[PDB]
Design an enzyme around this catalytic site. Structure first.
Site, short mmCIF file in Angstrom:
data_model
loop_
_atom_site.label_atom_id
_atom_site.label_comp_id
_atom_site.label_asym_id
_atom_site.label_seq_id
_atom_site.Cartn_x
_atom_site.Cartn_y
_atom_site.Cartn_z
N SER A 61 0.89 -1.17 0.00
CA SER A 61 0.00 0.00 0.00
C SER A 61 0.91 1.21 0.00
O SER A 61 1.71 1.30 -0.97
CB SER A 61 -0.97 -0.13 1.16
OG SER A 61 -1.87 0.97 1.22
N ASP A 70 -9.56 -3.65 -5.76
CA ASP A 70 -8.99 -2.65 -4.81
C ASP A 70 -9.82 -1.35 -4.91
O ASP A 70 -10.01 -0.81 -5.99
CB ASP A 70 -7.49 -2.50 -5.11
CG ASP A 70 -6.74 -1.77 -4.01
OD1 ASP A 70 -7.40 -0.95 -3.29
OD2 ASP A 70 -5.50 -1.99 -3.90
N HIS A 129 -7.57 -4.62 -1.45
CA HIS A 129 -6.38 -3.89 -1.01
C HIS A 129 -5.61 -4.70 0.03
O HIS A 129 -4.41 -4.50 0.16
CB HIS A 129 -6.80 -2.54 -0.41
CG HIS A 129 -5.62 -1.65 -0.28
ND1 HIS A 129 -4.81 -1.34 -1.36
CD2 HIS A 129 -5.11 -1.01 0.81
CE1 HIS A 129 -3.89 -0.50 -0.95
NE2 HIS A 129 -4.05 -0.28 0.38
#
Ligand code: MG
Ligand code: MG
Ligand code: MG
Length: 267
Positions: free
Chosen positions: A129, A175, A207
């Site tokens: 991320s 995501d 995600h």
């Protein structure tokens, strides 16, 4: 033959398994360590030199969210630090500095046990991320790194036209935090086509898919690191042309600058 090769000959089965062939031990990083928040170094018990990998977690997360990855990757024959950041809210470019400081700690700050097991010429970075954004930024400014693997990366910047480090971006089709259309895919496309690179989009995934044991991430992550940190051409056949895509695939799509060309010596 390639003197950085380590471990038995790979199969799909061995790369999808929970653990690699190498028993691993851990070193906890000292409390105040320079340039990052702390972490855990995972290293093969077997006395050899290995490449080293720094892995950053994401926004509001700790090393626990990438711990699986550090142990799994170390067990394939790598020294791996999973970091905590200064604070859990630090943005991607700060995470880039903290990845670099963690690399410095493994080669210049860790125990002799750790330092003796690192070939400090052979280094890589990875992150989830915002940690994935940090991976892109550090790769952009350290063309000496052997590999970079941003996992469901988030970064406000989409333009990585200076990255020379072999880069595998893992995106997650579903995501909603770092949509691949806004992050992973433009970031991938902007990397120069002369760079050894690939983009694997996980079918159905969110995600948070890289924050828990995933066979696809483990397999392709390890195979990338083998190919580039170890120059291990036993792993080329998994990367090029790469995984089968479509409806019963764990992979929605795969892009690459395959073929990945080798150099060589004569005995
Ligand atoms: Mg040789
Ligand atoms: Mg799909
Ligand atoms: Mg796509």
């Amino acid at each position: 033959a390639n003197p950085y090769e380590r471990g038995p000959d790979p199969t799909q089965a061995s790369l999808e398994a929970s653990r690699g062939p190498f028993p691993v031990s851990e070193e906890r990083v000292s409390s105040p360590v320079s340039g990052f928040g702390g972490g855990t170094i995972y290293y093969p018990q077997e006395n050899n030199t290995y490449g080293a990998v720094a892995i950053s977690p994401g926004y509001t997360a700790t090393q626990s969210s990438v711990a699986w990855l550090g142990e799994r990757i170390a067990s394939h024959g790598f020294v791996v630090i999973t970091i905590d950041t200064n604070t859990t809210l630090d943005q991607p470019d700060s995470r880039a500095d903290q990845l670099e400081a963690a690399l410095d700690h493994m080669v210049d700050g860790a125990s002799s046990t750790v330092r003796s097991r690192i070939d400090r010429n052979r280094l890589a970075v990875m992150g989830h991320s915002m940690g994935g954004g940090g991976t892109l930024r550090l790769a952009s400014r350290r063309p000496d790194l052997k590999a970079a693997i941003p996992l469901t990366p988030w970064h406000l910047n989409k333009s990585w036209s200076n990255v020379q480090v072999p880069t595998l971006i893992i995106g997650a089709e579903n995501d909603t935090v770092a949509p691949v259309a806004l992050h992973a895919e433009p970031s991938y496309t902007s990397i120069p086509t002369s760079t050894r690179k690939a983009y694997l989009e996980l079918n159905g995934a969110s995600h948070f898919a890289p924050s828990v044991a995933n066979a696809t991430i483990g397999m392709y992550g390890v195979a990338w690191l083998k190919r580039f940190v170890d120059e291990d051409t036993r792993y080329t056949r998994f990367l090029c042309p790469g995984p089968r895509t479509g409806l019963f695939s764990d992979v929605e799509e795969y892009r690459s600058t395959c073929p990945f060309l080798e150099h060589h010596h004569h005995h």
